[PDB]
Design a protein around this nucleic acid. Structure first.
Ligand code: CL
Ligand code: CL
Ligand code: MG
Ligand code: MG
Ligand code: MG
Lengths: 304, 300
DNA sequence: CGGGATATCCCG
DNA sequence: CGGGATATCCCG
DNA sequence: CGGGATATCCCG
DNA sequence: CGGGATATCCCG
C-alpha cells in the first residue's frame, strides 16, 4: 500500500520501450536523440524488390514526441551525414519498410566516408550472408567510448549537433546472428563488431574490428538476443564464414555500374569509365552493356 | 511477421523501474549509475532509530554484476559515493536505509558538494515535511553539453574505475509537494540542476532552478507523468521559501552532531573552539550535550 | 547530516 | 600472500 | 549501394 | 515569411 503513494503520480518515463516497424524494431534514446539499438531480420526475398531510396525522404519519426525528436535542421550543415542503422537496401521488398528506415529514429550522425564506405561494405556483407544462411538477424547502434588521457584519466567526449543536441557517436556496433537453415541442426553463428565513426580504408579487414559479445554488452550496457542459450553451441561467424568485405576492385566496379543510371551527360558517363581505367579495373559484360545503352540514351538527349 | 524478428528476443536495456522499501529507481547499465530515483518523504519516515554508521556501500544484488558498479571503482578515484535517495530520509527503517547504500543509488559526487550544498538541499526537502503532508522527490545524474568559444557543443565527462562509472557534470532534483490529501490547494513543484562541484553559501537555491520542460529536454525523461500539466501547479519557491541553511545554522548543527563522536576532552574542546573562531554563538541544545559528553569523559 | 583513511587481524 | 572485516580516527 | 547541394515553385 | 514539394546536379 505504501507503494501506491510512491507511484501515485507515476514513475518517470525513460521512453526506451521497443518500437516496431514493418521490418525493423528499435529502442530510442530520448536524451541523445538517436536510436539505442535497431534490430532487423533479412532474408533472400527481402533484399529484392522495386522499392527505391530516391523515392524516400529523411524526416522525424511521427511516433516520437517532438521534444525528444531529431530534425533535419540538426543534421544539414553539421558536417555529419544521416546514418541509417537499419539499411534501406535491406527493404527493397516493401516501400513502406524502406520509408520507415528514413525516420530519424533510425538515424545517427555518421562520418560521410564511413557511411558510404566501410559501413556500407559491412551492410553489403550482411546481405551477402543471405546467400549462405536462410536467416540473418542484425542489431546496430551507436557508442560513445572513453579515451585515456596522458595523465591516466579516462574521459568520454562527444559532439552534439543542432539546436536539439543530437549526439555524435565515437563508434558504431553491429551484432550479426545467422541460422544456416530452419531444418539444419547446425549451430548458430554470431559476431559482434565495433567500428570507429570515421573514414576506414580498404586495408583493415572486418575481423580487426571484431569483439566478444560480452565485451560489447559491457560497453553498450545492453544484452543482445536474451532468449539465445549461451550454454548451447554458438560458433564464431568469422570462423564459419569469411567475414570478408568487398575489396577495392569489386566495390569500385559495383559503384561505377550503379552510377551509370544517374549519369546526366555523356561527359559524366565517360568520367565513370575514366575512373575505372585509372584504377586499372576491367569492366565486366554487365557494366559494358549498361554503359553503352546508357550512352545511347544520353546521346539522343543531346540531339533535342 | 514480427515473430521472426523477435525470435531470439529484443535487446535488453535494463531500464525498468526497480522498487525498494522506500524508493524506486531506474538503473543505467551503460554508465553504471541510476538514471532516476523516486522517493516519497513524510515526517514519520525521517524519524526513527536506523543508524547511518551500521550501513555499508555495496553492490546492489538485484543488478547483473556485468553492469554493476563496485567500491573498487570509487575508492581512490578522487570522487565520493553520493546517494540519490538520502539515508537521512529513512531513519524509520534500517532496511530502507541499507538499501540507499546499494551502489544502484550512488553516483560519483564531489566531496564538498555531497557533504555541503547537496546535503543542504536534502535537508530542505526534509524541512518541507513540516509544512506539507506529502513530498515526492526525483533525483539523478546529468552529463550536459558545454558550448566552446568556437561554437562547437561537446559532452565531456570522466569515467572512473575498471568498470568506467560515469562521473556526472550536474545533479538534478525535482520536488513535488501536496499540502494534504484533504486540502484543495494546488501542488507545489520545483526543478533544480546543480553542478557536480563545490558551491558554498553565496548562491541561493533559486539560482539553480529550471523549468521542468527544460530539465526533461536535458535529461530525456518525463517526470510525474500522471500529473496534469494543464492543471494549476505552483512554483514551490513562491509557495515555500527554497532557503537553504546558512553558514551559521549549518555549522552549528555539524558541531552539535560531532559531539557524539568525540573520544577525548581535547577533540571535544576543539569543537567548541572551532565554533568560537567562526564567531558562532552556541545554543542550549549544543551546550546541554557538551556537558554530558564532557562529564561522561570526566569519568573515564 | 554527508563522506573519508588507516592499523590490525583473520585465514582461504 | 592478499583481500576483507573491523575498530578507530578523521574531514566539511 | 550510401550520402550531399542548389534552384524554384506553391501558398497558408 | 517559411516549410514542403519537386527538379536538377553532384560526391564516394
Ligand atoms: Cl570508409
Ligand atoms: Cl558545497
Ligand atoms: Mg548508411
Ligand atoms: Mg554522375
Ligand atoms: Mg549525499
Amino acid at each position: 500500500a505504501e507503494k501506491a503513494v510512491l507511484e501515485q503520480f507515476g514513475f518517470p518515463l525513460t521512453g526506451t520501450e521497443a518500437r516496431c516497424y514493418t521490418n525493423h524494431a528499435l529502442s530510442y534514446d530520448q536524451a541523445k536523440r538517436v536510436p539505442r539499438w535497431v534490430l532487423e531480420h533479412i532474408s533472400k526475398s527481402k533484399i529484392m524488390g522495386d522499392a527505391d531510396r530516391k523515392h524516400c525522404k529523411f524526416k522525424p519519426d511521427p511516433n516520437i514526441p517532438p521534444t525528444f525528436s531529431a530534425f533535419n535542421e540538426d543534421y544539414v550543415g553539421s558536417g555529419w551525414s544521416r546514418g541509417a542503422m537499419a539499411p534501406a537496401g535491406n527493404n527493397k521488398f516493401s516501400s513502406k519498410a524502406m520509408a520507415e528506415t528514413f525516420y530519424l529514429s533510425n538515424i545517427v550522425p555518421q562520418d560521410f566516408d564511413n557511411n558510404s564506405g566501410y559501413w556500407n561494405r559491412i551492410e553489403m556483407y550482411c546481405r551477402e550472408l543471405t546467400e549462405r544462411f536462410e536467416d540473418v538477424w542484425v542489431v546496430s547502434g551507436p557508442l560513445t567510448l572513453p579515451q585515456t588521457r596522458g595523465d591516466g584519466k579516462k574521459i568520454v567526449s562527444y559532439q552534439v549537433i543542432g539546436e536539439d543536441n543530437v549526439a555524435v557517436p565515437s563508434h558504431l556496433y553491429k551484432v550479426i546472428l545467422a541460422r544456416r537453415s530452419s531444418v539444419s541442426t547446425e549451430p548458430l553463428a554470431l559476431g559482434a563488431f565495433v567500428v570507429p565513426n570515421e573514414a576506414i580504408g580498404f586495408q583493415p579487414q572486418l575481423t580487426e574490428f571484431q569483439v566478444s559479445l560480452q565485451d560489447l554488452e559491457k560497453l553498450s550496457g545492453l544484452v543482445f538476443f536474451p532468449h539465445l542459450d549461451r550454454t548451447s553451441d554458438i560458433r564464431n561467424i568469422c570462423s564459419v564464414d569469411t567475414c570478408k568485405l568487398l575489396d577495392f576492385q569489386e566495390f569500385t566496379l559495383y559503384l561505377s555500374t550503379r552510377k551509370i543510371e544517374g549519369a546526366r551527360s555523356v561527359l559524366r558517363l565517360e568520367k565513370i569509365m575514366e575512373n575505372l581505367k585509372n584504377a586499372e579495373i576491367e569492366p565486366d559484360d554487365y557494366f559494358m552493356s549498361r554503359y553503352e545503352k546508357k550512352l545511347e540514351e544520353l546521346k539522343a538527349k543531346e540531339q533535342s
